[PDB]
Amino acid sequence: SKSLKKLVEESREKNQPEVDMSDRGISNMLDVNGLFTLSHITQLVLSHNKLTMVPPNIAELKNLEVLNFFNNQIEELPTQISSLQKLKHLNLGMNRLNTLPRGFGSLPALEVLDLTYNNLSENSLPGNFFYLTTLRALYLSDNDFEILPPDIGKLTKLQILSLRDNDLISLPKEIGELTQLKELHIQGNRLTVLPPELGNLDLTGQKQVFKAENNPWVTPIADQFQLGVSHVFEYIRSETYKYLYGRHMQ
């Protein structure tokens, strides 16, 4: 409805904290006159546009807590993105990211990271990625991960972890350290066994979610999935499963 000029000018003159520029055909953030003068705004929505980059100028939006780039064509993020010290919610879903910039893990307030439908893999993650220990929800579904790095175990505030439809061949035993987890999505990968340490998690309730269908599970595990998720968790806690799991690797 409103022009981009009016959105910027009204945000500034009335000290308004949220700016909605979703679905406006924007191909370059530098084209939006005055956008980077809004050092006070807390929410910027640029979903459903045609961005292919995010300029380093993003660092001038120092008050941002919510940044939504869902469904653009973004191919890389500037390293300056990690200077957003108030950023709590970052939605980069449905873009074309193959890497995250060095220092990305330096974001001190990040709670929700949506990276669904990109082209990320374990090699995409910078060295300091798992210093993001404020994270409570990490959405990585429909990416290209083949393994999950063991430092995932550092993210002990995580309540939601989505790894749906990646290419995972294993889960690290360090997943067992995520004792606040309520939702784990691992359906649609290439998983054959589960680390016994996943049995440390209670994902059996109506309140918890464990989605794990559509994996090439070994026969004993597949048999337990037929009986129900609680049966899977009991099985992988057993000493006999620990025995066979150790032998199956070798």
PDB file of C-alpha atoms in Angstrom:
ATOM      1  CA  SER A   1       0.000   0.000   0.000  1.00  0.00           C
ATOM      2  CA  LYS A   2       2.369   2.683   1.276  1.00  0.00           C
ATOM      3  CA  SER A   3       5.343   3.719  -0.821  1.00  0.00           C
ATOM      4  CA  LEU A   4       8.801   2.619   0.258  1.00  0.00           C
ATOM      5  CA  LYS A   5       9.546   6.298   0.834  1.00  0.00           C
ATOM      6  CA  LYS A   6       6.593   6.620   3.210  1.00  0.00           C
ATOM      7  CA  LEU A   7       7.530   3.435   5.068  1.00  0.00           C
ATOM      8  CA  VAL A   8      11.029   4.760   5.777  1.00  0.00           C
ATOM      9  CA  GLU A   9       9.987   8.327   6.559  1.00  0.00           C
ATOM     10  CA  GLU A  10       7.136   7.251   8.850  1.00  0.00           C
ATOM     11  CA  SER A  11       9.359   4.789  10.714  1.00  0.00           C
ATOM     12  CA  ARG A  12      11.873   7.600  11.337  1.00  0.00           C
ATOM     13  CA  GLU A  13       9.557  10.510  12.164  1.00  0.00           C
ATOM     14  CA  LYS A  14       7.303   8.513  14.523  1.00  0.00           C
ATOM     15  CA  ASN A  15      10.016   6.270  16.061  1.00  0.00           C
ATOM     16  CA  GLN A  16       8.196   3.146  14.814  1.00  0.00           C
ATOM     17  CA  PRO A  17      10.142  -0.077  15.455  1.00  0.00           C
ATOM     18  CA  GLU A  18       8.890  -2.443  12.702  1.00  0.00           C
ATOM     19  CA  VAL A  19       9.234  -2.117   8.914  1.00  0.00           C
ATOM     20  CA  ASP A  20       7.337  -4.472   6.568  1.00  0.00           C
ATOM     21  CA  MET A  21       8.676  -4.541   2.995  1.00  0.00           C
ATOM     22  CA  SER A  22       7.585  -8.073   2.134  1.00  0.00           C
ATOM     23  CA  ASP A  23       6.704  -8.878  -1.481  1.00  0.00           C
ATOM     24  CA  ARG A  24       7.662  -5.503  -2.961  1.00  0.00           C
ATOM     25  CA  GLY A  25       9.815  -6.712  -5.872  1.00  0.00           C
ATOM     26  CA  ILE A  26      13.010  -5.420  -4.250  1.00  0.00           C
ATOM     27  CA  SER A  27      16.166  -6.692  -5.965  1.00  0.00           C
ATOM     28  CA  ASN A  28      18.775  -4.626  -4.063  1.00  0.00           C
ATOM     29  CA  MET A  29      18.539  -3.273  -0.514  1.00  0.00           C
ATOM     30  CA  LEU A  30      20.741  -0.369  -1.606  1.00  0.00           C
ATOM     31  CA  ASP A  31      17.848   0.682  -3.884  1.00  0.00           C
ATOM     32  CA  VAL A  32      15.510   1.420  -0.938  1.00  0.00           C
ATOM     33  CA  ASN A  33      16.150   5.108  -0.254  1.00  0.00           C
ATOM     34  CA  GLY A  34      17.113   5.782   3.371  1.00  0.00           C
ATOM     35  CA  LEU A  35      16.662   2.207   4.577  1.00  0.00           C
ATOM     36  CA  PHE A  36      20.014   2.160   6.353  1.00  0.00           C
ATOM     37  CA  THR A  37      19.284   5.349   8.326  1.00  0.00           C
ATOM     38  CA  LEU A  38      16.815   3.395  10.514  1.00  0.00           C
ATOM     39  CA  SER A  39      19.238   2.634  13.350  1.00  0.00           C
ATOM     40  CA  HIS A  40      16.300   2.410  15.780  1.00  0.00           C
ATOM     41  CA  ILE A  41      14.128  -0.290  14.190  1.00  0.00           C
ATOM     42  CA  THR A  42      13.799  -3.698  15.816  1.00  0.00           C
ATOM     43  CA  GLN A  43      12.098  -5.656  13.014  1.00  0.00           C
ATOM     44  CA  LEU A  44      12.767  -5.670   9.269  1.00  0.00           C
ATOM     45  CA  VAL A  45      10.737  -7.969   6.999  1.00  0.00           C
ATOM     46  CA  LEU A  46      12.033  -8.413   3.442  1.00  0.00           C
ATOM     47  CA  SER A  47      10.529 -11.814   2.626  1.00  0.00           C
ATOM     48  CA  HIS A  48       9.305 -12.728  -0.875  1.00  0.00           C
ATOM     49  CA  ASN A  49      11.483 -10.243  -2.739  1.00  0.00           C
ATOM     50  CA  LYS A  50      14.302 -10.862  -5.242  1.00  0.00           C
ATOM     51  CA  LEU A  51      17.418 -10.107  -3.198  1.00  0.00           C
ATOM     52  CA  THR A  52      20.608 -11.918  -4.188  1.00  0.00           C
ATOM     53  CA  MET A  53      22.907 -10.243  -1.637  1.00  0.00           C
ATOM     54  CA  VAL A  54      22.782  -8.465   1.696  1.00  0.00           C
ATOM     55  CA  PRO A  55      25.097  -5.410   1.731  1.00  0.00           C
ATOM     56  CA  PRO A  56      27.570  -4.693   4.552  1.00  0.00           C
ATOM     57  CA  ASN A  57      25.393  -1.637   5.273  1.00  0.00           C
ATOM     58  CA  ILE A  58      23.132  -4.017   7.236  1.00  0.00           C
ATOM     59  CA  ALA A  59      25.427  -3.319  10.200  1.00  0.00           C
ATOM     60  CA  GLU A  60      24.019   0.224  10.419  1.00  0.00           C
ATOM     61  CA  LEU A  61      20.665  -1.244  11.566  1.00  0.00           C
ATOM     62  CA  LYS A  62      22.099  -1.758  15.021  1.00  0.00           C
ATOM     63  CA  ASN A  63      18.807  -2.197  16.937  1.00  0.00           C
ATOM     64  CA  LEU A  64      17.478  -5.114  14.867  1.00  0.00           C
ATOM     65  CA  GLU A  65      16.021  -8.062  16.797  1.00  0.00           C
ATOM     66  CA  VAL A  66      13.970  -9.681  13.992  1.00  0.00           C
ATOM     67  CA  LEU A  67      15.293  -9.967  10.436  1.00  0.00           C
ATOM     68  CA  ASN A  68      13.281 -11.949   7.876  1.00  0.00           C
ATOM     69  CA  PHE A  69      14.714 -12.718   4.425  1.00  0.00           C
ATOM     70  CA  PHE A  70      12.484 -15.750   3.763  1.00  0.00           C
ATOM     71  CA  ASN A  71      12.134 -16.687   0.067  1.00  0.00           C
ATOM     72  CA  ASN A  72      14.691 -14.525  -1.691  1.00  0.00           C
ATOM     73  CA  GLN A  73      17.695 -15.597  -3.813  1.00  0.00           C
ATOM     74  CA  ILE A  74      20.439 -14.713  -1.352  1.00  0.00           C
ATOM     75  CA  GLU A  75      23.762 -16.360  -2.149  1.00  0.00           C
ATOM     76  CA  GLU A  76      26.009 -15.025   0.625  1.00  0.00           C
ATOM     77  CA  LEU A  77      25.827 -13.024   3.853  1.00  0.00           C
ATOM     78  CA  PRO A  78      28.268 -10.233   4.713  1.00  0.00           C
ATOM     79  CA  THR A  79      30.541 -10.775   7.667  1.00  0.00           C
ATOM     80  CA  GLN A  80      29.102  -7.547   9.131  1.00  0.00           C
ATOM     81  CA  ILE A  81      25.900  -9.499   9.904  1.00  0.00           C
ATOM     82  CA  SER A  82      27.527 -10.672  13.148  1.00  0.00           C
ATOM     83  CA  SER A  83      27.668  -7.060  14.415  1.00  0.00           C
ATOM     84  CA  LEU A  84      23.880  -7.119  15.049  1.00  0.00           C
ATOM     85  CA  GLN A  85      24.164  -7.525  18.813  1.00  0.00           C
ATOM     86  CA  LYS A  86      20.399  -7.461  19.445  1.00  0.00           C
ATOM     87  CA  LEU A  87      19.461  -9.970  16.727  1.00  0.00           C
ATOM     88  CA  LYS A  88      17.196 -12.659  18.242  1.00  0.00           C
ATOM     89  CA  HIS A  89      15.365 -14.111  15.223  1.00  0.00           C
ATOM     90  CA  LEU A  90      16.978 -14.612  11.811  1.00  0.00           C
ATOM     91  CA  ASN A  91      14.938 -16.213   9.028  1.00  0.00           C
ATOM     92  CA  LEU A  92      17.037 -17.060   5.964  1.00  0.00           C
ATOM     93  CA  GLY A  93      14.798 -19.875   4.737  1.00  0.00           C
ATOM     94  CA  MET A  94      14.310 -20.534   1.014  1.00  0.00           C
ATOM     95  CA  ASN A  95      17.476 -18.840  -0.228  1.00  0.00           C
ATOM     96  CA  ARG A  96      20.613 -20.148  -1.960  1.00  0.00           C
ATOM     97  CA  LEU A  97      23.167 -20.037   0.874  1.00  0.00           C
ATOM     98  CA  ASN A  98      26.125 -22.429   0.550  1.00  0.00           C
ATOM     99  CA  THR A  99      28.175 -20.939   3.424  1.00  0.00           C
ATOM    100  CA  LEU A 100      27.878 -18.742   6.478  1.00  0.00           C
ATOM    101  CA  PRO A 101      30.489 -16.018   6.998  1.00  0.00           C
ATOM    102  CA  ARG A 102      33.375 -16.167   9.400  1.00  0.00           C
ATOM    103  CA  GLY A 103      32.412 -14.846  12.806  1.00  0.00           C
ATOM    104  CA  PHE A 104      28.726 -15.717  12.403  1.00  0.00           C
ATOM    105  CA  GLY A 105      28.864 -17.469  15.774  1.00  0.00           C
ATOM    106  CA  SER A 106      29.722 -14.138  17.452  1.00  0.00           C
ATOM    107  CA  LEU A 107      26.037 -13.094  17.468  1.00  0.00           C
ATOM    108  CA  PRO A 108      25.346 -12.731  21.221  1.00  0.00           C
ATOM    109  CA  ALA A 109      21.517 -12.785  21.349  1.00  0.00           C
ATOM    110  CA  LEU A 110      20.450 -15.205  18.612  1.00  0.00           C
ATOM    111  CA  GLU A 111      17.600 -17.470  19.771  1.00  0.00           C
ATOM    112  CA  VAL A 112      15.902 -18.663  16.551  1.00  0.00           C
ATOM    113  CA  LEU A 113      17.821 -19.476  13.357  1.00  0.00           C
ATOM    114  CA  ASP A 114      15.779 -20.617  10.356  1.00  0.00           C
ATOM    115  CA  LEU A 115      18.042 -21.824   7.539  1.00  0.00           C
ATOM    116  CA  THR A 116      15.570 -24.203   5.902  1.00  0.00           C
ATOM    117  CA  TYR A 117      15.712 -24.811   2.163  1.00  0.00           C
ATOM    118  CA  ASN A 118      19.266 -23.649   1.505  1.00  0.00           C
ATOM    119  CA  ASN A 119      22.377 -25.531   0.342  1.00  0.00           C
ATOM    120  CA  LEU A 120      24.262 -25.694   3.618  1.00  0.00           C
ATOM    121  CA  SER A 121      26.356 -28.639   4.749  1.00  0.00           C
ATOM    122  CA  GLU A 122      28.719 -29.309   7.625  1.00  0.00           C
ATOM    123  CA  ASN A 123      31.471 -27.640   5.570  1.00  0.00           C
ATOM    124  CA  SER A 124      29.363 -24.442   5.376  1.00  0.00           C
ATOM    125  CA  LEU A 125      29.717 -23.727   9.094  1.00  0.00           C
ATOM    126  CA  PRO A 126      32.383 -21.280  10.272  1.00  0.00           C
ATOM    127  CA  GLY A 127      34.814 -22.263  12.995  1.00  0.00           C
ATOM    128  CA  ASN A 128      32.922 -20.371  15.703  1.00  0.00           C
ATOM    129  CA  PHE A 129      29.394 -21.467  14.708  1.00  0.00           C
ATOM    130  CA  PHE A 130      28.761 -23.465  17.870  1.00  0.00           C
ATOM    131  CA  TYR A 131      29.461 -20.473  20.087  1.00  0.00           C
ATOM    132  CA  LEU A 132      25.789 -19.644  19.352  1.00  0.00           C
ATOM    133  CA  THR A 133      24.894 -21.120  22.734  1.00  0.00           C
ATOM    134  CA  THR A 134      21.843 -18.797  23.088  1.00  0.00           C
ATOM    135  CA  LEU A 135      20.032 -20.781  20.370  1.00  0.00           C
ATOM    136  CA  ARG A 136      16.677 -22.305  21.299  1.00  0.00           C
ATOM    137  CA  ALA A 137      15.452 -23.286  17.826  1.00  0.00           C
ATOM    138  CA  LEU A 138      17.648 -24.370  14.930  1.00  0.00           C
ATOM    139  CA  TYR A 139      15.886 -25.192  11.664  1.00  0.00           C
ATOM    140  CA  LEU A 140      18.124 -26.902   9.100  1.00  0.00           C
ATOM    141  CA  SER A 141      15.574 -28.952   7.166  1.00  0.00           C
ATOM    142  CA  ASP A 142      16.020 -29.394   3.403  1.00  0.00           C
ATOM    143  CA  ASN A 143      19.723 -28.642   3.326  1.00  0.00           C
ATOM    144  CA  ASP A 144      22.738 -30.785   2.381  1.00  0.00           C
ATOM    145  CA  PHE A 145      24.142 -32.002   5.707  1.00  0.00           C
ATOM    146  CA  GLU A 146      25.743 -35.461   5.703  1.00  0.00           C
ATOM    147  CA  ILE A 147      26.880 -35.376   9.332  1.00  0.00           C
ATOM    148  CA  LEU A 148      26.090 -33.081  12.239  1.00  0.00           C
ATOM    149  CA  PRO A 149      29.290 -31.842  13.950  1.00  0.00           C
ATOM    150  CA  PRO A 150      29.734 -33.076  17.542  1.00  0.00           C
ATOM    151  CA  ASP A 151      29.842 -29.495  18.829  1.00  0.00           C
ATOM    152  CA  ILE A 152      26.032 -29.471  18.409  1.00  0.00           C
ATOM    153  CA  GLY A 153      26.207 -30.731  21.997  1.00  0.00           C
ATOM    154  CA  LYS A 154      27.233 -27.243  23.126  1.00  0.00           C
ATOM    155  CA  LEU A 155      23.774 -25.822  22.273  1.00  0.00           C
ATOM    156  CA  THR A 156      22.111 -26.888  25.510  1.00  0.00           C
ATOM    157  CA  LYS A 157      19.328 -24.300  25.306  1.00  0.00           C
ATOM    158  CA  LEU A 158      18.011 -25.973  22.146  1.00  0.00           C
ATOM    159  CA  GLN A 159      14.370 -26.999  22.321  1.00  0.00           C
ATOM    160  CA  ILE A 160      13.773 -27.564  18.586  1.00  0.00           C
ATOM    161  CA  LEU A 161      16.214 -29.158  16.129  1.00  0.00           C
ATOM    162  CA  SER A 162      15.034 -29.837  12.587  1.00  0.00           C
ATOM    163  CA  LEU A 163      17.221 -31.905  10.256  1.00  0.00           C
ATOM    164  CA  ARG A 164      14.437 -33.157   7.971  1.00  0.00           C
ATOM    165  CA  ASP A 165      15.327 -34.211   4.423  1.00  0.00           C
ATOM    166  CA  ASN A 166      19.049 -33.588   4.571  1.00  0.00           C
ATOM    167  CA  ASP A 167      21.468 -36.377   3.571  1.00  0.00           C
ATOM    168  CA  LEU A 168      22.502 -37.457   7.054  1.00  0.00           C
ATOM    169  CA  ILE A 169      24.337 -40.770   7.407  1.00  0.00           C
ATOM    170  CA  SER A 170      24.805 -40.501  11.177  1.00  0.00           C
ATOM    171  CA  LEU A 171      23.829 -38.554  14.293  1.00  0.00           C
ATOM    172  CA  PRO A 172      26.506 -37.653  16.867  1.00  0.00           C
ATOM    173  CA  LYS A 173      26.209 -39.108  20.333  1.00  0.00           C
ATOM    174  CA  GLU A 174      26.500 -35.525  21.603  1.00  0.00           C
ATOM    175  CA  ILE A 175      22.813 -35.080  20.682  1.00  0.00           C
ATOM    176  CA  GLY A 176      22.256 -36.770  24.051  1.00  0.00           C
ATOM    177  CA  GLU A 177      23.502 -33.582  25.737  1.00  0.00           C
ATOM    178  CA  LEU A 178      20.537 -31.551  24.434  1.00  0.00           C
ATOM    179  CA  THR A 179      18.408 -32.356  27.449  1.00  0.00           C
ATOM    180  CA  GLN A 180      15.947 -29.474  26.931  1.00  0.00           C
ATOM    181  CA  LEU A 181      15.043 -30.748  23.463  1.00  0.00           C
ATOM    182  CA  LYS A 182      11.321 -31.095  22.829  1.00  0.00           C
ATOM    183  CA  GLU A 183      11.262 -31.553  19.039  1.00  0.00           C
ATOM    184  CA  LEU A 184      13.708 -33.515  16.901  1.00  0.00           C
ATOM    185  CA  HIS A 185      13.032 -33.979  13.170  1.00  0.00           C
ATOM    186  CA  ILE A 186      15.338 -36.424  11.356  1.00  0.00           C
ATOM    187  CA  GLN A 187      12.945 -38.007   8.845  1.00  0.00           C
ATOM    188  CA  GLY A 188      14.012 -38.399   5.229  1.00  0.00           C
ATOM    189  CA  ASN A 189      17.788 -38.895   5.634  1.00  0.00           C
ATOM    190  CA  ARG A 190      20.083 -41.919   5.121  1.00  0.00           C
ATOM    191  CA  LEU A 191      20.254 -42.954   8.785  1.00  0.00           C
ATOM    192  CA  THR A 192      20.676 -46.648   9.586  1.00  0.00           C
ATOM    193  CA  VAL A 193      21.433 -46.669  13.340  1.00  0.00           C
ATOM    194  CA  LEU A 194      20.921 -44.348  16.268  1.00  0.00           C
ATOM    195  CA  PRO A 195      23.597 -43.505  18.864  1.00  0.00           C
ATOM    196  CA  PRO A 196      22.636 -45.082  22.201  1.00  0.00           C
ATOM    197  CA  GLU A 197      23.123 -41.671  23.808  1.00  0.00           C
ATOM    198  CA  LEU A 198      19.955 -40.455  22.068  1.00  0.00           C
ATOM    199  CA  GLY A 199      18.179 -42.643  24.621  1.00  0.00           C
ATOM    200  CA  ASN A 200      19.093 -40.020  27.225  1.00  0.00           C
ATOM    201  CA  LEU A 201      16.334 -37.851  25.703  1.00  0.00           C
ATOM    202  CA  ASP A 202      12.637 -38.169  26.529  1.00  0.00           C
ATOM    203  CA  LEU A 203      10.871 -37.366  23.264  1.00  0.00           C
ATOM    204  CA  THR A 204       7.992 -39.756  23.953  1.00  0.00           C
ATOM    205  CA  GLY A 205       5.205 -37.505  25.223  1.00  0.00           C
ATOM    206  CA  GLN A 206       2.281 -35.881  23.489  1.00  0.00           C
ATOM    207  CA  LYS A 207       4.175 -32.646  24.220  1.00  0.00           C
ATOM    208  CA  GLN A 208       7.381 -33.831  22.522  1.00  0.00           C
ATOM    209  CA  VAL A 209       8.003 -34.571  18.841  1.00  0.00           C
ATOM    210  CA  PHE A 210      10.306 -37.225  17.363  1.00  0.00           C
ATOM    211  CA  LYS A 211       9.909 -37.583  13.585  1.00  0.00           C
ATOM    212  CA  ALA A 212      12.197 -40.206  12.118  1.00  0.00           C
ATOM    213  CA  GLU A 213      10.233 -42.025   9.380  1.00  0.00           C
ATOM    214  CA  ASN A 214      11.647 -42.546   5.874  1.00  0.00           C
ATOM    215  CA  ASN A 215      15.175 -43.602   6.832  1.00  0.00           C
ATOM    216  CA  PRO A 216      16.875 -46.892   5.854  1.00  0.00           C
ATOM    217  CA  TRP A 217      16.843 -48.163   9.445  1.00  0.00           C
ATOM    218  CA  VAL A 218      18.435 -51.501  10.305  1.00  0.00           C
ATOM    219  CA  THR A 219      15.825 -54.216  10.845  1.00  0.00           C
ATOM    220  CA  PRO A 220      15.676 -54.225  14.701  1.00  0.00           C
ATOM    221  CA  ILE A 221      15.231 -50.444  14.804  1.00  0.00           C
ATOM    222  CA  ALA A 222      12.693 -50.550  11.972  1.00  0.00           C
ATOM    223  CA  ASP A 223      10.760 -53.179  13.950  1.00  0.00           C
ATOM    224  CA  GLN A 224      10.642 -50.888  16.999  1.00  0.00           C
ATOM    225  CA  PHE A 225       9.354 -47.958  14.939  1.00  0.00           C
ATOM    226  CA  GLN A 226       6.422 -50.191  13.988  1.00  0.00           C
ATOM    227  CA  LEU A 227       5.568 -50.597  17.676  1.00  0.00           C
ATOM    228  CA  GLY A 228       5.949 -46.889  18.460  1.00  0.00           C
ATOM    229  CA  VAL A 229       8.469 -44.210  19.395  1.00  0.00           C
ATOM    230  CA  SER A 230       8.581 -45.239  23.057  1.00  0.00           C
ATOM    231  CA  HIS A 231       9.718 -48.717  21.978  1.00  0.00           C
ATOM    232  CA  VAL A 232      12.549 -47.230  19.913  1.00  0.00           C
ATOM    233  CA  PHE A 233      13.841 -45.242  22.863  1.00  0.00           C
ATOM    234  CA  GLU A 234      13.750 -48.242  25.207  1.00  0.00           C
ATOM    235  CA  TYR A 235      15.553 -50.368  22.640  1.00  0.00           C
ATOM    236  CA  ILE A 236      18.475 -47.991  22.103  1.00  0.00           C
ATOM    237  CA  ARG A 237      18.979 -47.625  25.860  1.00  0.00           C
ATOM    238  CA  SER A 238      19.491 -51.390  26.285  1.00  0.00           C
ATOM    239  CA  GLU A 239      22.896 -52.948  26.821  1.00  0.00           C
ATOM    240  CA  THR A 240      22.189 -55.365  23.985  1.00  0.00           C
ATOM    241  CA  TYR A 241      21.685 -52.496  21.556  1.00  0.00           C
ATOM    242  CA  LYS A 242      24.861 -50.834  22.825  1.00  0.00           C
ATOM    243  CA  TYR A 243      26.638 -54.140  22.132  1.00  0.00           C
ATOM    244  CA  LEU A 244      25.251 -54.578  18.612  1.00  0.00           C
ATOM    245  CA  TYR A 245      25.736 -50.900  17.770  1.00  0.00           C
ATOM    246  CA  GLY A 246      29.421 -51.163  18.677  1.00  0.00           C
ATOM    247  CA  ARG A 247      29.747 -54.325  16.577  1.00  0.00           C
ATOM    248  CA  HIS A 248      27.754 -52.890  13.654  1.00  0.00           C
ATOM    249  CA  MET A 249      30.139 -49.968  13.234  1.00  0.00           C
ATOM    250  CA  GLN A 250      33.061 -52.367  12.922  1.00  0.00           C
TER     251      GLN A 250
END
